[PDB]
Amino acid sequence: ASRILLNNGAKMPILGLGTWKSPPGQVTEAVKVAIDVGYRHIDCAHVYQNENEVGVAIQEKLREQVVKREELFIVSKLWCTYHEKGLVKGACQKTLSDLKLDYLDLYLIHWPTGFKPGKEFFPLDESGNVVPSDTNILDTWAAMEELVDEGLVKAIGISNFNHLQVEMILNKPGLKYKPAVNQIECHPYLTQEKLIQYCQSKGIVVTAYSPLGSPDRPWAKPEDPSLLEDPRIKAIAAKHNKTTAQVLIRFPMQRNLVVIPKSVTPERIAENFKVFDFELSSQDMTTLLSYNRNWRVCALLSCTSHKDYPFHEEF
Ligand SMILES: NC(=O)c1ccc[n+]([C@@H]2O[C@H](COP(=O)([O-])OP(=O)(O)OC[C@H]3O[C@@H](n4cnc5c(N)ncnc54)[C@H](OP(=O)(O)O)[C@@H]3O)[C@@H](O)[C@H]2O)c1
Numbered sequence: 142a143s144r145i146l147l148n149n150g151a152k153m154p155i156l157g158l159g160t161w162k163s164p165p166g167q168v169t170e171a172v173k174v175a176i177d178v179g180y181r182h183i184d185c186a187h188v189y190q191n192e193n194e195v196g197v198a199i200q201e202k203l204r205e206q207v208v209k210r211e212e213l214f215i216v217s218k219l220w221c222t223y224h225e226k227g228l229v230k231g232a233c234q235k236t237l238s239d240l241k242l243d244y245l246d247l248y249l250i251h252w253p254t255g256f257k258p259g260k261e262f263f264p265l266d267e268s269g270n271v272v273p274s275d276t277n278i279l280d281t282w283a284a285m286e287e288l289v290d291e292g293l294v295k296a297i298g299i300s301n302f303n304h305l306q307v308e309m310i311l312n313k314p315g316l317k318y319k320p321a322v323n324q325i326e327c328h329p330y331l332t333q334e335k336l337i338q339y340c341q342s343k344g345i346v347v348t349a350y351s352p353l354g355s356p357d358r359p360w361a362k363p364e365d366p367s368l369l370e371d372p373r374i375k376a377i378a379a380k381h382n383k384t385t386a387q388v389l390i391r392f393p394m395q396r397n398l399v400v401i402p403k404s405v406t407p408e409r410i411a412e413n414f415k416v417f418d419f420e421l422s423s424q425d426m427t428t429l430l431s432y433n434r435n436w437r438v439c440a441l442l443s444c445t446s447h448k449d450y451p452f453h454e455e456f
């Protein structure tokens with residue numbers, strides 16, 4: 142099946158297009174091509190600085206009669222500098238305005254950490270520490286719930302939450318909406334077995350981000366492992382007459398995850414969608430899972446002292 146059922150009765154496409162690091166000058170075409178070749182889920186965020194240009198593409202394809210709004214599944218995320226209850230609606234509305242939409246299909250708390258409100262996405266003190274805000278997970282969640290009640294978003298969820306942070310929300314007496322999704326880094330070097338088991342057992346759908354290992358992440362080092370160039374994964378791909386990227390995208394799909402590979406390269410956008418015509422074997426799945434090294438690429442040292450930093454916990 143190409144979609145997975147969420148807790149609001151809506152269906153979410155299991156394959157979406159990522160947009161982090163898709164430059165504004167290049168992302169409109171990426172999204173147009175993606176829609177043309179069958180993508181219906183686009184993963185966005187205010188912090189990606191390109192929601193206007195994503196919105197332009199969506200608008201263009203709506204006007205061309207290529208898709209209708211109901212067929213699209215548009216995700217965005219509340220940035221860390223907007224966790225204060227009084228800032229959440231405006232942040233969501235800014236995203237809606239930029240995307241030229243009147244609702245989101247899913248809106249996520251981007252990270253559990255609140256940062257000092259202000260213009261800078263990563264406010265630092267003079268010694269390089271992120272400056273936190275006096276906000277907490279439960280109050281931010283309550284503000285997210287209001288967005289559903291007001292019709293701005295159809296579902297809400299979380300991202301980069303560890304299991305204890307998810308538990309905090311789940312256990313709130315007076316909870317109005319359970320998180321529908323937890324979006325987390327997941328690939329063969331960070332397989333997330335425990336957090337995936339936890340979320341799936343709690344009826345929360347997991348989305349795998351950086352499924353190709355985010356080789357374009359701005360802090361990558363030459364000595365860092367590289368999934369796309371891993372000769373072992375290349376061998377699995379060759380056996381299936383597929384590319385390594387296609388294997389890396391199919392992998393989470395077979396774990397009942399949603400997956401959101403990013404590209405701005407039209408050939409790759411098309412390639413990455415051609416993952417519904419083959420199956421990884423039981424041995425392939427076992428082999429890929431065996432490559433786990435707990436090698437997390439997506440974190441930021443300057444955030445490690447934040448009270449709500451998610452990655453001190455085992456999972
Ligand atoms: N919630 C969060 O905190 C969070 C964090 C990270 C990511 N995400 C989401 O997840 C998405 C995906 O993760 P990501 O952007 O970190 O990285 P990714 O999808 O793992 O990798 C993207 C990189 O792979 C390249 N690529 C794509 N398809 C390829 C192919 N078929 N062959 C070879 N190279 C290929 C891209 O190049 P080109 O684009 O130049 O083609 C880009 O450099 C993000 O864009 C974002 O939407 C969310």
Ligand SMILES: Cc1nc(C)c(Cc2nc3c(F)c(F)cc(F)c3s2)cc1CC(=O)O
Pocket residue numbers: 161186188189221251252254439440441442444445447449450451
């Ligand atoms: C845009 C962006 N910038 C940075 C620097 C990171 C790494 C990050 N690591 C962390 C982290 F450990 C925290 F506790 C809190 C954070 F906000 C970040 S952001 C990821 C992304 C992509 C995205 O967020 O979707």
